[PDB]
């Protein structure tokens with residue numbers, strides 16, 4: 131299984147964004163995140179776990195959370211995030227994704243307004259390791275109202291016991307009754323970024339549900355989509371989305 135130090139050196143954030151941000155999946159993820167945050171889940175603080183170099187998973191969340199903390203294992207990934215946050219020239223063009231979210235939300239606001247709301251919400255950009263009892267290391271944070279994690283845990287966990295432990299580790303960042311939002315690939319053993327291969331833990335819906343209950347959460351809803359990534363990218367059998375609450 132891919133060692134975590136491989137994410138520091140061999141995960142190219144720009145290439146990842148070019149390759150995936152595939153469109154049918156992105157549309158579905160955006161609809162689900164809009165449903166969760168704008169049509170319910172809210173608070174003062176949301177922690178996004180394994181953010182990578184993406185901002186798409188935060189576009190509807192910034193309407194419901196005063197503060198958003200973005201986290202990842204890779205320093206290169208956080209640097210790419212910060213380029214967009216600081217509106218740098220070499221920052222990735224999220225404008226077609228931003229326009230799509232504005233349409234879903236009833237066309238209340240336009241693209242630049244949406245982007246400014248996200249940039250204002252993101253207060254901290256932090257290093258994280260989901261395999262650690264303290265994922266944020268020595269960095270102190272108030273208990274979060276919500277912990278979000280998109281397409282991370284399958285890639286970060288080498289086996290089912292580590293996956294369950296990672297869910298418990300994420301729980302330590304959550305207030306009692308706090309929400310856990312996870313969206314990830316089903317039965318995927320790898321994913322590609324050009325010629326670079328990355329391992330993935332191939333989990334079915336039953337193993338995901340069991341791990342979440344074992345980790346001390348109650349599931350509110352669980353959705354499975356049949357849509358898989360292109361043959362050239364991965365071997366997944368769809369994706370899942372779940373909303374759970376910490377016991």
Ligand SMILES: Nc1ncnc2c1ncn2[C@@H]1O[C@H](CSCC[C@H](N)C(=O)O)[C@@H](O)[C@H]1O
Pocket residue numbers: 134137141179180181182183184187202203204207258259260261279280281282285286
């Ligand atoms: N142990 C670990 N702890 C935290 N993040 C990890 C990790 N191992 C890998 N990652 C991160 O998991 C990410 C997978 S890519 C997912 C990126 C983004 N959330 C999206 O939805 O597209 C990478 O950014 C990688 O750096």
Ligand SMILES: CNc1cc(C)c(C(N)=O)c[n+]1C
Pocket residue numbers: 150281282284285315318319320321329330331359364366
């Ligand atoms: C689009 N990003 C993806 C896609 C897939 C299919 C997997 C996986 N777990 O195989 C991981 N990431 C990060």
